[PDB]
Design a protein around this nucleic acid. Structure first.
Lengths: 57, 57
DNA sequence: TTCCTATGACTCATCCAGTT
DNA sequence: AAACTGGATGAGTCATAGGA
């Protein structure tokens, strides 16, 4: 192992934990986009229900 | 002396430029929708507070 | 066989952070 | 210390999977 050799198999792992970590950062941004659409589904229905027992505007 | 292989890299290297613009744009694309959706749903939460005050809970 | 791209993995040159 | 020690980012290149 030169310090370049040591260094390379170690950088190679820090490039790794980051692809793994970059995978998670988008799988979550998919979920915050999911739940927000389930919340807009239930919320505009809720409005149409209380809307009905009063007026249309 | 030359480029057999310098054509295979200058093309693979375009392809990695390309594959990486896609991931860049699905990521900014979803994040705008997290801001957008967020915004619709506060307005709707307010309209629901209001119609449950016009009428009730 | 043979060719060709799209994506994972590894290397390189930076650059940044903690730490004393 | 804008230079120790070692991790971490961006972009080219390598190894492979899939496609035709």
């Amino acid at each position: 192992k030169d310090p370049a050799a040591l260094k390379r198999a170690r950088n190679t792992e820090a490039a790794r934990r980051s692809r793994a970590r970059k995978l998670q950062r988008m799988k979550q941004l998919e979920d915050k986009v999911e739940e927000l659409l389930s919340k807009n589904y239930h919320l505009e229905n809720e409005v149409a229900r209380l809307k009905k027992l009063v007026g249309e505007r």
